[PDB]
Amino acid sequence: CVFCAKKDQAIDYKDTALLRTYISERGKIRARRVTGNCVQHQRDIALAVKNAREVALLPFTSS
Amino acid sequence: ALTAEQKKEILRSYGLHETDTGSPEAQIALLTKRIADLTEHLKVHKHDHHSRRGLLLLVGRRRRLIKYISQIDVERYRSLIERLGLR
Amino acid sequence: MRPYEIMVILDPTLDERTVAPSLETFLNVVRKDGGKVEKVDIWGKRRLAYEIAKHAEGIYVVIDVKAAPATVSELDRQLSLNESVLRTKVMRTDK
Amino acid sequence: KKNVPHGAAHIKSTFNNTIVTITDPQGNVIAWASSGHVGFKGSRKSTPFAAQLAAENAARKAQDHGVRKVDVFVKGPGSGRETAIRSLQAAGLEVGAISDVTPQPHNGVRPPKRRRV
Amino acid sequence: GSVIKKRRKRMSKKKHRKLLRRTRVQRRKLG
Amino acid sequence: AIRKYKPTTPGRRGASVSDFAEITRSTPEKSLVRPLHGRGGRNAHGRITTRHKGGGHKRAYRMIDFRRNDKDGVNAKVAHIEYDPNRTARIALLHYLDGEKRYIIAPNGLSQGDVVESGANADIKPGNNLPLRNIPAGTLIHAVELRPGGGAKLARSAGSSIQLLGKEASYASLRMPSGEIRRVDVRCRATVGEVGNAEQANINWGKAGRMRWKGKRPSVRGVVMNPVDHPHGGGEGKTSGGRHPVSPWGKPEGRTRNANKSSNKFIVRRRR
RNA sequence: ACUGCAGGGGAGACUGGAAUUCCUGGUGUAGCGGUGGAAUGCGCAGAUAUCAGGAGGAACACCGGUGGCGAAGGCGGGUCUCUGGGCAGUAACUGACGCUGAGGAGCGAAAGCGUGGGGAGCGAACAGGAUUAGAUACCCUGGUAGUCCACGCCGUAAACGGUGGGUACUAGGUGUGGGUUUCCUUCCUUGGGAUCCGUGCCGUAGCUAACGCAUUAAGUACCCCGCCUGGGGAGUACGGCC
């Protein structure tokens, strides 16, 4: 559903505003199907989120 | 690293000519290179037995190729052996 | 020759005090090894999602170095031993 | 005995007990853990009715110092947290922070085995 | 059920092992 | 790092010995070697106080530098690694750039040509000796003096190490190998790393003679002595003692520490 | 061989944190904890609770699934060094060098074993309490070995798809993973279609004792290997190897 013609600029961890749309209020990981993503991008996200969390860009539990 | 540079230099020395990838000789030479790098890897860490399996398979290929050579020629056989050393 | 993105965190006070020196002091070492410095860009300071035992706010340092991996591992070693280095992350640039 | 501008409720329920206590946002205790003071034993003290009594007595302790607003930090699955919530509302203290703090540890420790009916 | 085919062997090995744990020693070791 | 001797004779079945692989074929410098002699376990009055130190083998000792003072920005190179009879550890010979040969307990696999830094501005790469104040917590060290300039006294043997558990206003929280926690003056010097010769515990000395060579005599059991010589003695039927374990002079195997010792302001956690 | 792609493939080193336990201190107190119910036990010497701070070991939620990779067992907290394997397209090279493979060699969960470390929590054994006519079992408390790490041994199991490997061929459809490429070429759809692998479902024929399988065949058909020939006695004994 998403990431159709937007295969130019990557995301990585420099877009917490966007990734906020890819996580819960707590910051839990949304399923591929929530966004209609491709798995490649899903796992890229899974790693990105974890890294950002380890550098406290995002919390582990936004309580 | 088993890069194109390594491949080409080996083909330039052991290989027959530039566009030679079907040569038993060339293939063997490159496999022994894989043996060199990978064996060196196994000298340390001594637990990636999956890549070790990969090694053993390559050894299998090399053995079969020299067997074929044994049916094709003895001059190339001995020449190659002179380059390498069969234990 | 191993394009790496390197991120470093610290109290912004020391960053403003040692904008360049605290960085050049080792980036030049990398150059001595034969490296390549691309950036020292800092996204100011930012609040942490959680407090790292202290310093609820820190900095967003991005370096980007295309050096030899050995030099890089030495860099990380030096920095991690430097008490002003928090949560250094180092990421590759390809598969 | 001191005035309380604002308190910090902590409630933890179980399948055999529950506690209700008010701490200081500073991090100390204002209102002693109120459950168990009712003469209940065993599974009886886990019940919602007990939750009501604990909430009431907590309010009494709360007004022995003087407070009107206490934040709510609830955890510990049990016989019905909302019974305690409603009884504290019956006591009539400002809820403030109603949000739960239910622990959700990431998958670490191997649990015990009571899986034998 | 087909389990029956497995139980006889279960019991048989059990008595074997039990018989030897009763003698993992000079009672059997000497022989 | 241990070769096992082959069973040939009955005295050498499981006997083993360190390979000495880290040892360079090198003899000690006569400028540093100092003599000594056995005293058994005899004091100045000629009476034996320690009952198992007699015998042994002719041995010298080395002037180990612990009160490290020549460290004002001065580096040193490892030249040789030498066997030290008096220690379970092994030693390293350092040459100072200004000219000076000193021995010190080697931590890791140091080798000829390893540059060693010392002082205050040195990094904490293994081998350097600098004060705790300048060392980050969460690492291991050795050769720690208990007083400024008093000389290293903790963690000198093979495998010994001290972990840093943070610092105080003017003290430092050290975790000794035993597990005890102690606060020490931060101005004390320490050698970073640990003594990478951790195999002596895995050496089974074999025949008795090796311990007689080393310098350990037989340890006669108390039970078999006669009553006047040991409380557990006497009896007909190879008994134990009739009360409980005590020393030969009547001292229960309990806590002998002087409870009012002037160190309880530094000890905060005891071992198990 | 070249070019591209996916991947929890593996090792090694470094490493973050939620949380649990313990500890220091503060708060404040007579119940906690536990269940079917209840007890044992814990707690008055301030337990539990609660705030902060500290130590340490283990496992690594969400993503994560019906999914991926691996010969298999198995493998998903992160970063990084090293490193294996596989797929599509290209068809640059050799020109049958292929397949299988007794005996043989190697890998091989958990449990177990050696030596040594570690040891939070859990937890055989064990102890106690409860239950029971009895209960050396369930239930509860506490709790050893062990689980963990370094290096070694044993080489077993539904080590199971209860399906050896390879090869060729034969109704379809529906879902899915990877990649290539066409029509719609923007109708944006990144759809439909073709093609190669892999994957899960339903299903024609055919087969099958039936159940069921069915382009991933348990169908047609070749090669090689392996194993049985009533159940028990028994995958045990004598013997021999490890």
TrEMBL record, chain A:
Coiled coil: none annotated. The keyword Mitochondrion does not apply. GO terms for molecular function: small ribosomal subunit rRNA binding; structural constituent of ribosome. One of its GO terms (biological process) is translation. The keyword Signal does not apply. One of its GO terms (cellular component) is cytosolic small ribosomal subunit. Keywords: Ribonucleoprotein, Ribosomal protein, RNA-binding, rRNA-binding. Belongs to the bacterial ribosomal protein bS18 family. Binds as a heterodimer with protein bS6 to the central domain of the 16S rRNA, where it helps stabilize the platform of the 30S subunit. Part of the 30S ribosomal subunit. Forms a tight heterodimer with protein bS6. This is Small ribosomal subunit protein bS18. It comes from Mycobacterium tuberculosis. The gene is rpsR. The chain holds residues 20 to 82 of 84 of the full protein.
UniProtKB/TrEMBL annotation, chain B:
The keyword Ribosomal protein applies. It holds the Pfam family Ribosomal_S15. SUPFAM superfamilies: S15/NS1 RNA-binding domain (SSF47060). One of its GO terms (biological process) is translation. Keywords: Ribonucleoprotein, Ribosomal protein, RNA-binding, rRNA-binding. InterPro entries: Ribosomal_uS15, Ribosomal_uS15_bac-type, uS15_NS1_RNA-bd_sf. GO terms for cellular component: cytosolic small ribosomal subunit. Part of the 30S ribosomal subunit. Forms a bridge to the 50S subunit in the 70S ribosome, contacting the 23S rRNA. Forms an intersubunit bridge (bridge B4) with the 23S rRNA of the 50S subunit in the ribosome. One of the primary rRNA binding proteins, it binds directly to 16S rRNA where it helps nucleate assembly of the platform of the 30S subunit by binding and bridging several RNA helices of the 16S rRNA. Belongs to the universal ribosomal protein uS15 family. This is Small ribosomal subunit protein uS15. The lineage of its organism: Bacteria, Bacillati, Actinomycetota, Actinomycetes, Mycobacteriales.
TrEMBL record, chain C:
One of its GO terms (cellular component) is cytoplasm. PROSITE patterns: RIBOSOMAL_S6. The keyword Ligase does not apply. GO terms for molecular function: small ribosomal subunit rRNA binding; structural constituent of ribosome. Keywords: Ribonucleoprotein, Ribosomal protein, RNA-binding, rRNA-binding. GO terms for biological process: translation. It comes from the Bacteria. Belongs to the bacterial ribosomal protein bS6 family. Binds together with bS18 to 16S ribosomal RNA. This is Small ribosomal subunit protein bS6. The gene is rpsF.
TrEMBL record, chain F:
Residues 36-58 have a biased composition (Basic residues). Residues 41-118 form the Large ribosomal subunit protein uL2 RNA-binding domain. Residues 26-58, 224-272 are annotated as: Disordered. One of its GO terms (cellular component) is large ribosomal subunit. Keywords: Ribonucleoprotein, Ribosomal protein, RNA-binding, rRNA-binding. PROSITE patterns: RIBOSOMAL_L2 (PS00467). GO terms for biological process: cytoplasmic translation. The keyword rRNA-binding applies. One of its GO terms (molecular function) is structural constituent of ribosome. It holds the Pfam family Ribosomal_L2_C. Belongs to the universal ribosomal protein uL2 family. One of the primary rRNA binding proteins. Required for association of the 30S and 50S subunits to form the 70S ribosome, for tRNA binding and peptide bond formation. It has been suggested to have peptidyltransferase activity; this is somewhat controversial. Makes several contacts with the 16S rRNA in the 70S ribosome. PANTHER family: LARGE RIBOSOMAL SUBUNIT PROTEIN UL2M, RIBOSOMAL PROTEIN L2. This is Large ribosomal subunit protein uL2. It comes from Mycobacterium tuberculosis. The lineage of its organism: Bacteria, Bacillati, Actinomycetota, Actinomycetes, Mycobacteriales. The gene is rplB.
